[PDB]
From a paper:
Mammals express three isoforms (α, β and γ) of phosphatidylinositol 5-phosphate 4-kinases (PI5P4Ks), the enzymes that generate phosphatidylinositol bisphosphate (PIP2) from phosphatidylinositol phosphate (PIP), principally via the conversion of PI(5)P to PI(4,5)P2. The series was optimised to deliver ARUK2002821 (36), a potent PI5P4Kα inhibitor (pIC50 = 8.0) which is selective vs. other PI5P4K isoforms and has broad selectivity against lipid and protein kinases.
In order to solve a structure of a co-complex of PI5P4Kα with a ligand from this series, a truncated version of human PI5P4Kα was cloned into a bacterial expression vector. Overall, the protein structure with 36 bound shows a high degree of similarity with that of the apo structure. 36 binds deeply in the hydrophobic cleft that forms the ATP binding site in lipid kinases. The NH linker in 36 forms a hydrogen bond with the side-chain oxygen acceptor of Asn198, while N1 (see heterocycle numbering in Table 3) of compound 36's pyrrolopyrimidine forms a hydrogen bond with the main-chain nitrogen of Val199. Furthermore, N3 of the pyrrolopyrimidine is seen to make a hydrogen bond interaction with an ordered water in the binding site. The side-chains of Phe134, Asn124, Lys145 and Lys209 have been re-orientated compared with the apo structure.
Residue numbers in the entry:
A (entry chain A), B (entry chain A): 35 to 125, 133 to 215, 228 to 288, 327 to 368, 387 to 406
């Protein structure tokens, strides 16, 4: 697939170039308006590695390098995950081959919005020491191969890179991914057996994160919820995840009826209210937090 | 200097890309019409490593890779010589920092001529197993930084990368480099004390090489002659050179009045007769070989 080739090639180039750039003492205003573009033309050469004619553009390379650091991600590890082997498609989005990252096609509009929030996003991240349920935006690029132009973004996978998820929801509190929905969560009677301390830590993150979203007039986000079943996985020792990698995982409590491990975080935030030119951002967050607070009562 | 930066950067990229390309069982006709171009644009990014906006084009990358191999040169070694440290200028041409290679600015006309002869050049090289006094053309590029476009070519240094040359001539047999000339060779009474076997091997190379030149209607070439003085170098053990690296070196004979080592080869061949739109190529070679055969009598 020529678009994955260019992505793998562009990321590889992106990180290697960056390896020559000094880690700054701080980001500057201009860092949030910067880009690197590269255009390759091979005439009668290299027909076999990948396409002869392509472009690759990286937005705000210093910023996303900074964010990778703040999210506990090493540039060389990142490069490896995206280049050692091709991303795996999903009937859409890809997964890095080691399942650490999601690669997702987005619109120019989405790209523009990511730009409009990137300063506030950064600041929010600093302020919370990288501990948040918001998407972790790791890099953002434009590809051209042939007359096909596309925008992609890379986020941390909400789910474990190792523990399998036998059941998944996407919750809004009121096209779309292969998940179960609000109504299904309700009808199924789905419970999440985590302790009071873990509910408290989780919700107090959610409340701040969501408030940030409302302030930005963003909407239509949801809480992605994945359940690993441990006794099923019998058919790091069993039930274990590295928290430093599987950053959204929370163990069930001692009295959970089933040995579960849960992966919950916010996804798909880049819809601005005005872009819908219904529900305002305030009403959306209010419904959203009420539903989440509810299903975790 | 932004033009050396782009060159170092372009070569580095050139060889690394090539490291992914399979060594072919043979060159194809299209290999001699091929190129790779790359254009970089950095807005508000990477201001410190090198220029923000540049282009780099490599001509016939498969061909010059082949020639590097046939001349006993490993691609990674080549890359290192040109990138580990900046080329050193000459008041003009540069030297690779380890003195193995010459980098030389040339005209588009020269570039066009290199192209016109590149097939015959290749064939000639094969036929003689790489043993020749002709320039060893190792790579050829176009650089653009700012609105400054330039063409460069890389050849093997005629002189030792290690033994110093205290005296240099550029001989034609009838602007210009820092060398002594025909008349000076004559007035000085300059002798070259090599044995009959070495004269014979050298001249029989020269005769074939020069004949090749005449066949191509090339002109205005010369024999670059450099003398290392061994007793002076007292003010690999003394007098030694690796022939595999210092490919043009010939030891003086047992009865030379002074312990010398000599570096002789042909340079500066890319002038085609027609380009001068005097002396024809035949007369030029005839004068040239007669003078060389003469100074080695
Ligand atoms: C087998 O099913 C799954 C496997 C894995 C996942 N995990 C994800 N972790 C984080 N972001 C994600 C995903 C999926 C998509 N996105 C994502 C990214 C970025 C944008 C901009 C948008 C809109 C979505 C979700 C599912 Cl369903
Ligand atoms: C200190 O002085 C020197 C040190 C070193 C050298 N050695 C060289 N070995 C091979 N080609 C060379 C040179 C110099 C130039 N060129 C060269 C290359 C390519 C083109 C196209 C043209 C015209 C010349 C010569 C001198 Cl004088």
């Amino acid at each position: 697939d020529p678009l994955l080739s260019v992505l793998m090639w562009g990321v590889n180039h992106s990180i290697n170039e960056l390896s020559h750039v000094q880690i700054p003492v701080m980001l500057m205003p201009d860092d949030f308006k910067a880009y690197s573009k590269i255009k390759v033309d091979n005439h009668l050469f290299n027909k076999e590695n990948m396409p002869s004619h392509f472009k690759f553009k990286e937005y705000c390379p210093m910023v996303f390098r900074n964010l990778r650091e703040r999210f506990g991600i090493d540039d060389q590890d990142f490069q490896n995950s995206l280049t050692r082997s091709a991303p795996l498609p999903n009937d859409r989005f890809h997964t890095s081959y080691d399942k650490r990252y999601i690669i997702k096609t987005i619109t120019s509009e989405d790209v523009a919005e990511m730009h409009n929030i990137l300063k506030k996003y950064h600041q929010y991240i600093v302020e919370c020491h990288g501990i948040t349920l918001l998407p972790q935006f790791l890099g953002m690029y434009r590809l051209n191969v042939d007359g096909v132009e596309i925008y992609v973004i890379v986020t941390r996978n909400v789910f474990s890179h190792r523990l399998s998820v036998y059941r998944k929801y996407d919750l809004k509190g009121s096209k779309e991914l292969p998940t179960l929905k609000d109504n299904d969560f309700i009808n199924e009677g789905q419970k999440i057996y985590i302790d009071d301390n873990n509910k408290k830590v989780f919700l107090e993150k959610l409340k701040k994160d969501v408030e940030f979203l409302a302030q930005l007039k963003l909407m239509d986000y949801s809480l992605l919820v994945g359940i690993h079943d441990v006794e099923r996985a019998e058919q790091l020792a069993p039930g274990e995840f590295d928290p430093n990698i599987d950053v959204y995982g929370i163990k069930c409590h001692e009295n959970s009826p089933r040995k579960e491990v849960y992966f919950m975080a916010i996804i798909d935030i880049l819809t601005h209210y005005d872009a819908k030119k219904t529900v305002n951002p305030e009403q959306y967050s209010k419904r959203f937090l009420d539903f989440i607070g509810h299903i975790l009562t």
